[PDB]
Amino acid sequence: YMLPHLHNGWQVDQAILSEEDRVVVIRFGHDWDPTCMKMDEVLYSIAEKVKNFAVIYLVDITEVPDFNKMYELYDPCTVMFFFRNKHIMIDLGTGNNNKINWAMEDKQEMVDIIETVYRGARKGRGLVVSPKDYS
Template sequence: MSSYLLTVLTKKQEVDAIIRDTIDKVLVLRFGRASDPVCLQLDDILSKSAREVSKFGSVALVDIDSNEIQVYVKYFDITFIPSTVFFFNAHHMKMDFGTADHTKWVGAFHKKQDFIDVVEAIYRGAMKGKLIVSCPLPPERIPKYQLLYKDV
């Protein structure tokens, strides 16, 4: 239901345009499916937080089942959903979550404030010229997952 409140992107051109056109704000792209229960939980948090972060962030949802989006799914190695990727002025922003993968947030946020804190930390770091920032959340509120390596 809350995914109706946020922009849903299904074409590569739409993703390219929003990455290119979002200036001086953190762009939050949630890769997932509208039918997945964890994605719905995350979408609820994102939609409730979108107004609070609107001064320094924008949120959009990317449908990973769209054929045109598969370029991004492969590029960001989206194997777990939902996965959330952050950009600032068309640069991919990374965050050290204490996991092996700094390129994306995997899973849902526990609380609305957790999401706001992460976006704010990325914004503050990006304004200082950093491309990777430390996660402001305590380790117990960061989802844990096991990385799977294909063809290794």
């Protein structure tokens, strides 16, 4: 019951474009990467829980480098959020509102973040605050 993967820019475009009522969660990185391994285990374990309002996709940014420049994907692991084709920003308290770029292994915490993104974006917020301050 693995997480779905997207294998080119075109597929990523279609996936971001295809959800009217769910957050599109994208993990940019590589399966082989340790940070990605920890983040993937979280995403895998919450995928069923959030499936009504979020879909999660994994993208290998070697196989799919299309967005590297666009979203400055220079970290080992990057989770980003999209709603109705729009990049949703989250104030995590880190100074960077564009992405989660560390493996947070708190399962419920990740669920709560996704739910906040969904609830915010549905009400037209392009920026939302994370429930916990990450320093």
